[PDB]
Amino acid sequence: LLLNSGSREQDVRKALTISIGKGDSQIISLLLRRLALDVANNSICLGGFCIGKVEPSWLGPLFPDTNIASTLARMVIRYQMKSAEYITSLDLSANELRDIDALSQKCCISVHLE
């Protein structure tokens, strides 16, 4: 929800380093989707972000594989008015890796890796 809204790229990058400190796959997958996925040309551009290693559970969701708040918003603005296709690019370059062997095992990624 916060990333679909306007978030600065420096903020998302710093928070990516934070969330890679306490490594949790789903959140850093969402951050990488906001940062380094270019769906228009089947492009992952995971470049200058200096991440230590890479887990296949991270970039896993990058591969293609309730109207509650809206009705609340519509009611309250009414009251406000009344009161008024594979992806073939994978680029992992400037991230200072030390062993790419984590991607080597048969994870949930290899069909995309082929």
Partner: peptide
């Protein structure tokens, strides 16, 4: 500096 289209 990069090839990501939606970059700063």
């Amino acid at each position: 500096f990069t090839l990501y289209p939606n970059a700063a």
